[PDB]
Amino acid sequence: DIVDRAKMEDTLKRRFFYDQAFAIYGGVSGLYDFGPVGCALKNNIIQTWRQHFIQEEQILEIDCTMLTPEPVLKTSGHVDKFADFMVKDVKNGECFRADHLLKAHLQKLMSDKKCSVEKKSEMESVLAQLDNYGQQELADLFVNYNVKSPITGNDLSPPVSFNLMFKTFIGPGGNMPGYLRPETAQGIFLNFKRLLEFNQGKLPFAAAQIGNSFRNEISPRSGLIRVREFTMAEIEHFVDPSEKDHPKFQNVADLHLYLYSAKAQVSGQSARKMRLGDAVEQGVINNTVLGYFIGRIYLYLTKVGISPDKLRFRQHMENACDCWDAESKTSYGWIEIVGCADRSCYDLSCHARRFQKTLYVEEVVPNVIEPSFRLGRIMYTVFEHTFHVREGDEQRTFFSFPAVVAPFKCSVLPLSQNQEFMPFVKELSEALTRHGVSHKVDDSSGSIGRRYARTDEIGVAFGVTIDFDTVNKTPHTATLRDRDSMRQIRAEISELPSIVQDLANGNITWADVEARYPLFEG
Amino acid sequence: DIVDRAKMEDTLKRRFFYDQAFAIYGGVSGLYDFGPVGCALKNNIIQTWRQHFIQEEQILEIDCTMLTPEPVLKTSGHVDKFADFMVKDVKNGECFRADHLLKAHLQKLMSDKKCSVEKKSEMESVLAQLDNYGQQELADLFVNYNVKSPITGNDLSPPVSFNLMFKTFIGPGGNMPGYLRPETAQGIFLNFKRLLEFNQGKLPFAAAQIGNSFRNEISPRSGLIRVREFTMAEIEHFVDPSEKDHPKFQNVADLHLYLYSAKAQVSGQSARKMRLGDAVEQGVINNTVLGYFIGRIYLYLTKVGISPDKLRFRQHMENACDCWDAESKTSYGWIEIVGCADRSCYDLSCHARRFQKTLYVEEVVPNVIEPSFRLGRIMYTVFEHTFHVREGDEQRTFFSFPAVVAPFKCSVLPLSQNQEFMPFVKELSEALTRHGVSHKVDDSSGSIGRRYARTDEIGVAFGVTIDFDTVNKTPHTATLRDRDSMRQIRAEISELPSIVQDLANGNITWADVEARYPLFEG
Ligand SMILES: [Cl-]
Ligand SMILES: [Cl-]
């Protein structure tokens, strides 16, 4: 199935990729701190994103505030940037997510069988409408299914709407009640005119922003999946409805990805692998502008370490907007990691009322494709998809991060610290920085095998061990180790920077290296 | 004196470096949005910082949340992370900063002269104690100087303490009242043990965090100086009080910087330029650990574009902690851009109660040096110190950003878009990326001189113009222009990437280039 997450989490906590925020205070749900190793990974993911989108598409980056006054979020959704129905408990006051309790409790009596078959079908009919039940309706369903507090046990209260925005006051007194932005896309809209003027009024242009957003979750209890603070990457691509073709679609048309259309969901079909070019041809994917980004998102996700076999794109379906969500399969099931919405009528129209004056005195209300990246979930998906366990009964752990994402690409290992290795270590380190390869000198105590096990544990792609022979014999050669296979070669210490650079940047494979340079074993 | 800021601000707004947040709503004070050009600059500043500190000192980066519960900030300062005295107005309710009104009003009657000389001395005696007057005391001073609302005009209310933290509720209901972090340093303290364990319990180690902090200012009205949301870079360097020597101090001991000690302030002396090595020797700067960071901060600030002649380091003085603040001179006067505090008794002690077990069963309470960077103010300081005006009565504008900080380093200018230049433009762009030089192809309409004026306006360091001769004559050569001097050369289009790389990275000077490659003029 998925992954031994109990092991993975232990390694993630022990090596301090990330951990519970304010742990020495009991901790806060939905809040996490990222350690040195987690930051390196996060920064690499974000940097890879900047190269994949901002640099590639000439996107106009923006940096807006997280503090937003009330009036601004009233023209978007003081209700629907999001409010979840919340049921309280008339003692023990504990709050719950309505959709969650009803669903879980339905699955309880849905599978408890002195029960009926006609009830199964009834509860299925209800589950297929959960997300779209209004308030009353839901309250009735709570009473009609006798839903009580899961962990015992008192009766429940009519599900009331609960806004997921963090309230605050921007200033002295209380005349400017503000909100912590629940999403980054809105800041871009408010800046459409300045962005348009910056692009000289021309019209295909993309605007992006990488920052934190806040969602006041009722009861987050699923690790990095449901969190209250998270880093998000947003793109707002603006197109003239007339020219709905992307000139660069042919670069992606040939990809094969799993598509899970709305119609495939209505009629209980399965996710279907499909050529992206065919997808647009067959009409399952509306246009090539939407198609291009879907393929670029696919390329980015697989590049960062997500498995293609556990990656799908789900179109939603009457639950306005043509959205395809990049979903990854984890131990929590299929989670939405990247949203990509095609939108005719959008949220700039509400805000500003902007338009672009395409020549001849015509005001154009541009269509908008907005790919939104859940960076933390993307990061967590990499953990699960990349985590492996080695053979021995000292069941050792390692992450198979792509070199472009791993905390650092190379680890130099000199034998027990001697004034002897230093000049060689220093030269390797300096030469390694000159080829743009990240590294950390291992000044750690233990066997040469135990030290590599530690670096494997955090996913370091490569390793160079410097021994006495390296210092004292005259082709000065050290050994290069591959993380995944654990296989080693013996190359000249002055060429190593070049071949590690060529391995990180997929210019050559390990097989290529083992074909040019001698093998090594202990 | 300083700078024609009225002009600078116009250019900063017109080119959209940054602008007022929510402008189309009346705007919010202390909140600003950074445009495409501003982001490029900001990202470059931050990246230069990561290289200058994190990479150079092997600092352990961390990523903590901005949401902090009440109890955590109660062990730091529910009063003194900061509360400013605020005076309200018994009609027109307008709120004011007490320290501000009193000072401004004192300077009013301090310089209004049917007045006395003995009053001058009295008001000076008061001004030299402003920051340290308690609440009553201050209320009396308000009455005793008959301080009324500046912009008319009703009587004022006793100055009450006003916490500058943004209040919020982390969760459903209201049992976990939280705060938006006013500073980044605290998150590092709470993670001292995990950071210590990550450093294997050894003890000199530095921990850093780059993120946003929030300060609910009463009435911000000084551009990017006093803001409510800002990006901050924090370093927490932990040292054993026994080994208070930095092995790398000799790399900085030879710098010459202006030092403004506490004793020089008490006895109205002037800021004094001084060799950093001498400074530690003469005892003005306590130790070399503090000294090293002061010099590293100086190096960073000048590297990013701040003028050495308008940069000083001010030690404060009974207003616990040995702090030196990097201050820059602007049109607003001397502003604190980087704080650097040497602290014996710190804020981990309050939080956790951590310690490091230096061998032999001794628990060490480590001293902490914490350089904190106000990135936005640093950025603004660069604007003022770097902004210039060219000669002609079409008074043209340009920013002299260092190449390492400028939005992008190079601008390629082909003559009016022709299928002719494209292959040369494409090759230059691709070759330019291969040498790690940022660039943007100018697809703009206008004269070849007007187009460069536009790129100069945003501070682009270099420019390469491709003309017909470049395409049709057989040493294919284009012209390279220097931003500052406007001088040009004519080099082979395939060598240009190398020499632009060598100019950006201060490997060679423009004079060197003009000594190897032919000159050009129109
Ligand atoms: Cl996320
Ligand atoms: Cl700042």
Query: CA-CA distance, A466 to A196, in Å (whole number)?
Result: 56
CB A62 within 8 Å of CB A191: yes
Residues of A in contact with B71 (CB under 8 A): 25
Residues B58, B59, B63, B67, Cα dihedral to 10°: 180
* CATH architecture, range B81-164: 2-Layer Sandwich (3.30)
The C-alpha atoms of residue A190 and residue B22 are separated, in whole angstroms, by 7
Q: Tell me the backbone φ, ψ of residue B103, rounded to 5 degrees.
A: -60, -50
**Separation of CA B45 and ligand 2 centre (Å):** 12
- CB contact (8 A) between residue B36 and residue A64: no
Alpha helices in A435-495 (DSSP H): 448-457, 468-472
Please give, rounded to a whole number of angstroms, the shortest distance from the CA of B208 to a CA of chain A: 9
Cβ–Cβ gap A22/B69 under 8 Å: yes
Query: Rounded to whole angstroms, how far apart are CA atoms B392 and A498?
Result: 51
Residue A438 burial (CB count, 10 A) = 19
Residue B35 DSSP code: -
Residue A465 has a CB neighbour count (10 Å cut-off) of 21
C-alpha closest to that of A247 among A303, A310, A278, A204: A204
Mutate to test the interface with A, among B37, B66, B157, B191 (most CBs of A within 10 A): B191
Strands B177-180 and B67-69: antiparallel
Nearest chain B residue to A40 by CA distance is B61
Residue contact A32–B173, C-beta within 8 A: no
Residues 6+ apart with CB under 8 A from A358: A203, A240, A364
CA distance A32 to chain B (A): 7
Helix, strand or coil, per DSSP, at residue A102 = helix
**Strand, helix or coil at B188?**
helix
Contacts of B392 (CB under 8 A, 6+ apart): none
What are the φ/ψ torsions at residue A295 (nearest 5 degrees)?
-70, -35
Strand partners, A336: A327
In angstroms, what CA-CA distances link B122 with B112, B133, B159, B317, B397?
Answer: 15, 15, 21, 21, 46
A495 is in an annotated binding site: no
Separation of B336 CA from ligand 2 center, angstroms? 10
Give every CB contact of residue B469 below 8 A, 6+ residues apart in sequence. Answer: B477
**Cα–Cα separations (whole angstroms), residue B98 to B78, B89, B95, B133:** 19, 12, 9, 11
Using CA atoms, how far apart are residues B18 and B224, in angstroms rounded to an integer? Answer: 9
Query: Across the A/B interface, how many CB contacts are shorter than 8 Å?
Result: 166
User: What CA–CA distance (Å, rounded) separates B21 from A178?
Assistant: 13
Q: Which residues are A333's β-sheet partners? A: A330
Tokens of B362: 């001794």
Contact B191, B64 (CB under 8 A): yes
Residues 6+ apart with CB under 8 A from B413: B442, B448, B451, B452, B463, B464, B465, B466
Method: X-ray
DSSP letter string, B127-151: HTTGGG--HHHHHHHHHHTT---SS
Q: Which two tokens mark A214?
A: 């806040």
Q: Which residues of B touch A21 (CB under 8 A)?
A: 64-65
CA angle A497, A500, A504 (to 5 degrees): 135
Q: Give B444's contacts in chain A (Cβ within 8 Å).
A: 200
Residues of B within 8 A of A68 (CB-CB) are 22
Angle between helices B422-434 and B496-504 (to 10 degrees): 40
Scan for tokens 């001292």, then name that residue.
Answer: B192
Tell me the angle at which helices A36-49 and A375-386 cross, rounded to the nearest 10 degrees. Answer: 110
H or E stretch covering B299: helix B288-304
β-bridge mates for residue B34, sequence order: A63, B18
Do the beta carbons of residue A337 and residue A377 sit within 8 Å?
Answer: yes
What 3-state DSSP class applies to A111?
coil
Whether B291 contacts B252, CB under 8 Å: yes
A199 is in an annotated binding site: no
Here the tokens at position A310 are: 């556990």
Residue B179 CA to ligand 2 center (angstroms) comes to: 20
Contact A187, A69 (CB under 8 A): no
* Binding-site annotation: residue ranges of B for ATP: 215-217, 226-227, 336-337, 377
Coil vs helix vs strand at A56: helix
Q: Cα dihedral sign for B125, B127, B128, B133?
A: positive
In what helix (H) or strand (E) does residue B242 lie, and over which residues does it extend?
A: none
Least CB–CB distance from B167: residue in A71, A169, A214: A169
CA of residue A226 to ligand 1 center, whole Å: 8
Phi, psi of B126, deg, nearest 5? -80, -45
The tokens for A143 are 């009473």
**Token pair in block for residue A272:** 């279907």
SS (H, E, C) A306-318: CCHHHEEEEECCC
Listed by number, the residues of chain A in 230-269 with a beta carbon closer than 8 Å to a beta carbon of chain B are none
Q: How far apart are CA A31 and CA A159, in angstroms?
A: 26
Task: Dig out the tokens for B346 from the structure.
Answer: 């710190």
Token output for A140: 């009735």
Encoded amino acid at A485, one letter? S
Q: How long is chain A?
A: 522
CATH 3.40.50.2300 at A401-522, yes or no: no
Given a contact cutoff of 8 angstroms between Cβ atoms, the answer to whether A413 and A463 are in contact is yes
Phi first, then psi: give them for residue A143, nearest 5 degrees.
-70, -40
Within an 8 Å CB–CB cutoff, is residue B64 touching chain A?
yes
- Name which of B215, B192, B214 is nearest B203 in CA terms: B192
Hey, what are A75's tokens?
Answer: 């023209």
Distance between first and last Cα of chain B: 36
CA distance A285 to A502: 37
Binding residue per annotation — A372? yes
Angle of helix A288-304 versus helix A375-386 axis, rounded to 10 = 50
- DSSP-derived 3-state class of residue B182: coil
Q: Judging by beta carbons within 10 Å of its beta carbon (0-12, 13-18, 19+), is residue A146 exposed, middle or buried?
A: exposed
Assess whether the previous peptide bond of A201 is cis (omega < 30° from 0): no
Query: Residues B177, B70: contact at Cβ < 8 Å?
Result: yes
Of the residues A39, A65, A82, A445, the best mutation for testing chain B's interface (the one with the most B CB atoms within 10 Å of its CB) is: A65
In B, minimum Cα distance to A219 occurs at B171
CA distance A156 to A142: 8
Beta strands B311-315; B256-260: pairing state = parallel
Ligand 1 mean position, distance from CA A336 (Å):
10
Query: Which residue of chain A comes nearest to B214, CA vs CA?
Result: A67
Residue A215 assigned as binding residue: yes
Residue with tokens 């100069």: B456
Side chain identity, residue A185: A
CB A403 within 8 A of CB A461: yes
Listed residue (B326, B259, B277, B334) closest to B298, CA to CA: B326
Tell me the C-alpha distance between B351 and B493, whole Å. 60
In A415-512, where do the E strands start and end? 439-441, 462-466, 477-482, 488-492
Question: A265: exposed, middle or buried (C-beta count within 10 Å: 0-12, 13-18, 19+)?
Answer: middle
Return the structure tokens found at B320.
Answer: 């616990």
DSSP string, A292-356: HHHHHHHHHHHHHT--GGGEEEEEP-----EEEEEEEEETTEEEEEEEEEEESS-SHHHHH---E
CB B209 within 8 A of CB B188: yes
* CB of A156 closer than 8 Å to CB of A87: yes
Distance CA A330, CA B435 (A): 40
Exposed, middle or buried, B61 (CB in 10 Å: 0-12/13-18/19+)? buried
How many Å is the maximal CA-CA distance in chain B?
A: 84
Start-to-end C-alpha separation, chain A: 36
Buried b vs exposed e over B208-240: b needs ≥16 C-beta within 10 Å? bbbbbbbbbbbbbeebbbbbbbbbbbbbbbbbb
For residues B39 and B44, what is the distance between their CA atoms, to the nearest angstrom? 8
The full length of chain B comes to 522
A245 token code pair: 């073709």
DSSP designation for A63: B
- Where in chain B are the domains? 1-80+165-400, 81-164, 401-522
- When CB atoms are compared, the residue of A31, A62, A190 closest to B36 is A62
Q: After which residues are there C–N gaps above 2.5 Å in chain B?
A: 319, 353
DSSP structural state of residue B355? -
Q: In 3-state terms, what secondary structure has residue B64? A: coil
Tell me how many helices (H) and strands (E) chain B has: 19, 27
Across-strand partners of A69? A178
- Determine contact, residues B284/B259, Cβ cutoff 8 Å: yes
Q: How far is the CA of A69 from the centre of ligand 1 (A)?
A: 24
CA proximity to A166, closest of A118, A228, A119, A76: A228
Q: For residues B7 and B15, what is the distance between their CA atoms, to the nearest angstrom? A: 12
- Burial (CB count <10 Å: 0-12, 13-18, 19+), residue A167: middle
The secondary structure of B362-395 as a DSSP string is EEE--EEEEEEEEHHHHHHHHHHHHEEE-SSSS-
Omega of the bond leading into B153 within 30 degrees of 0 (cis): yes
* Contact present, B354 and B348 (Cβ < 8 Å): yes
Spatial contact of B307 and B260, defined as CB atoms under 8 Å apart? no
CATH of domain A1-80+165-400: 3.30.930.10
Of B63, B69, B212, the CB nearest to A42: B63
Q: Do the Cβ atoms of A212 and A66 come closer than 8 Å?
A: yes
Residue B348 parent element (H or E): helix B348-352
Distance, C-alpha B389 to centroid of its chain: 23
Instruction: Decide: B44 and B22 in contact? Cβ < 8 Å.
Output: no
Helix (H, G, I), strand (E, B) or coil at B402: coil
Distance, C-alpha B41 to centroid of its chain: 12
At residue B332, what are phi and psi to the nearest 5 degrees? -95, 0
Nearest of A94, A45, A108, A60 to residue B33 by alpha carbon: A60
- Helices within B392-522 (DSSP H only): 422-434, 448-457, 468-472, 496-504, 510-516
| Ramachandran sector of residue B30 (left: φ over 0; alpha: ψ -120 to 50; beta: rest) | left
* Ion ligand 2 contact residues with beta carbon within 5 A: B 230, 374, 376-377
> Which residues of chain A are within 8 Å of residue B208 when distances are taken between CB atoms?
none
- Reference B390, options B453, B444, B340; nearest CA is B453
Of A312, A415, A405, A214, the closest CA to residue B170 belongs to A214
Treating both helix axes as pointing N-terminal to C-terminal, what angle do B36-49 and B288-304 enclose, rounded to 10 degrees? 150
Gap from B322 CA to chain A (nearest CA, Å): 28
Residues 6+ apart with CB under 8 A from A142: A87, A98, A102, A156, A158, A159
Angle between helices A98-110 and A117-127 (to 10 degrees): 160
Alpha carbon of A377 to ligand 1 centroid (Å): 4
A341 has which bridge partners? A323, A370
CA distance A204 to A327: 27
Instruction: Give dist(CA A47, CA A438) in Å, integer.
Output: 14
The amino acid present at A313, given as its one-letter code, is: F
Q: Is residue B30 a contact partner of residue B21, using CB atoms and an 8 Å limit?
A: no
- Euclidean distance between CA atoms A66 and A68, whole angstroms: 6
- Residue B340, classified by CB atoms within 10 Å of its CB into exposed (0-12), middle (13-18) or buried (19+), is buried
State how far Cα A460 lies from the chain centre.
20
Q: Do residues A462 and A510 touch, judged by C-beta distance below 8 A?
A: no
Separation of alpha carbons A384 and A331, rounded Å: 8
Nearest to A24 by CA among B99, B151, B190, B421: B190
Q: How far is A487 from chain B (nearest CA, A)?
A: 28
Of B190, B198, B218, the CB nearest to A172: B218
Neighbours of B338 (CB within 10 A): 25
In the structure encoding, which two tokens stand for residue B261, read together?
């000690």
| Contact flag B36-A60 (C-beta cutoff 8 Å) | yes
Q: Which of residues 165-194 of A touch B (CB under 8 A)?
A: 166-173, 176, 180, 187, 190-191, 194
Structural Rg of chain A based on CA atoms: 27
Contact A52, A327 (CB under 8 A): no
Q: How far is ligand 1, taken at its centre, from the CA of residue B119, in Å?
A: 61
- Name the H helices within A177-286: 185-189, 192-198, 262-266, 276-281
What's the number of CA atoms in the CB half-sphere (13 Å) around residue A166?
A: 29
Grouping H, G, I as helix, E, B as strand and the rest as coil, residue A484 is coil
Amino acid (one-letter) located at B339? G
User: Which residues does a gap of C–N over 2.5 Å follow in chain A?
Assistant: 319, 353
Residue A387 near residue A399 (C-beta atoms within 8 A):
yes
Measured over the CA atoms of residue B192, residue B197, residue B199 and residue B203, the dihedral's sign is: positive
Query: To the nearest 10°, the Cα dihedral for B420, B426, B427, B428?
Result: 100
